[PDB]
Structure formats: C-alpha cells, structure tokens
C-alpha cells in the first residue's frame, strides 16, 4: 500500500454514450433525431448542400514557386547581442555550434530586431540594409559569402 495519488484532472474519463437515460447520452446518443447525420454520415466535400462551394466560387492566384525558393535561416541582431561577444567571426560554424541555426541550412540572413553593441566580424550570405548600416555604425565588418 503506497497510493500512487494521481494528480487531479490528469485523465478525463470518456464520453461513453448510448448506455442509459440517466447518463444524458441515452438512446439517440448525441446524434439527434433522424436524417443523414443520424446514421454515420455527412457529405464531406466542404459541402454546402449543392450550392457552389466557396473554394469553387473564388478564383486562383498563381503558382507556389516551390522547387526554386532560396530558403535560409533568419538571425537577428538582438540574438547576436544576447549570445556572442567581441572579436569572433559570426558565421555558419559558430552560429551552428551556439545553436542559433540548425545545420540543415547554410545560407543565413541577418535581420535587425533588437540592438547590437559588440564589435564582431560577419561571414554571411545576405544582409538587410538597415542591419548593415547599424552594424557598420557600431564598427563591425561584413563579408558577403
């Protein structure tokens, strides 16, 4: 005897249905009276009862351009300030080991949320104009790779 003492609310019971009048889920079991829905079914296809559905009244807009996206990771100046220090090269290797990106992507971009105060060296693939202005102003260096 040690009485595991489960935390409360850790397991709802169930919605056992069709098991008597007193349970509130009696003969009809939550389905209503009759019709299509009383017997397992509902016409799925976003159906509006034969009215032309919304996704068929509206028109389309174009391709998705996948298979040709240049997808790659965003890193912000506030993040660099919070995580790094002076003199090292913010690049693929250091951001990867410091866990700012994952080594699936290798084309990082640097954005300008938060503020950066530390002189650093950068070896990145793209940079926003606002961010490089702020970074040159603080006195860092920028090589585009």
């Amino acid at each position: 005897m040690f009485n595991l003492l489960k935390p409360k609310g850790a397991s709802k019971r169930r919605k056992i249905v069709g098991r008597g009048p007193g349970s509130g889920l009696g003969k009809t079991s939550g389905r209503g009276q009759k019709g299509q829905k009383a017997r397992n079914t509902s016409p799925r296809l976003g159906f509006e009862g034969g009215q032309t559905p919304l996704y068929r009244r509206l028109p389309r807009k174009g391709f998705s351009n996948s298979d040709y996206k240049l997808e790659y990771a965003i890193v912000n100046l506030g993040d660099i300030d919070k995580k790094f220090k002076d003199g090292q090269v913010v690049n693929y290797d250091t951001l990867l080991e410091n866990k700012l990106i994952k080594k699936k992507n290798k084309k990082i971009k640097i954005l300008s949320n938060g503020k950066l105060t530390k002189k650093v060296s950068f070896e990145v693939s793209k940079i926003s104009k606002s961010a490089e202005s702020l970074v040159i102003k603080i006195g860092c260096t920028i090589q585009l790779v």
Binding site: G46, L54, Y55, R56, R57, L58, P59, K61
Partner: protein
C-alpha cells in the same frame, strides 16, 4: 503515417492564411466580361480581400496543415 489527413487541394489553391487567423482570398467577378463594369468596381475587385469570420473554422478544417 498510415492515415495522414489529406489536404483539399482545390481549397489550397484559393485560400491563404494570415499570421493570426484571418484568411486571404482573391475576389470574384474580374475574370470575364469587363467592359460594362464600372471602373471603380473593377478597381475594388482587383484588390484582395479577407473572408468573413464565419468561414474560418470550416476553412481550417479544409486545410489541415497549411
């Protein structure tokens, strides 16, 4: 993986999701006979719109992943 819910492609090609819930879409009636339609009507039909909040739940069911 045996039973991944399939998206509704014909709906994907027409609906888009904004960051906090709303659904973006392209307005109708600007595809076809256009000479008779007034210029301000056509200009309003060009700009994209947002759907009423009443369809968002059904659309979220139609696009289980997007």
């Amino acid at each position: 993986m045996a039973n991944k819910m399939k998206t509704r492609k014909s709906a994907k090609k027409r609906y888009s999701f904004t960051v906090n819930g709303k659904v973006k879409y392209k307005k109708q009636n600007l595809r076809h006979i256009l000479t008779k339609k007034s210029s301000k009507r056509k200009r309003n039909l060009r700009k994209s719109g947002n759907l009423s909040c009443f369809e968002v739940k059904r659309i979220k069911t139609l696009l289980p992943y997007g």
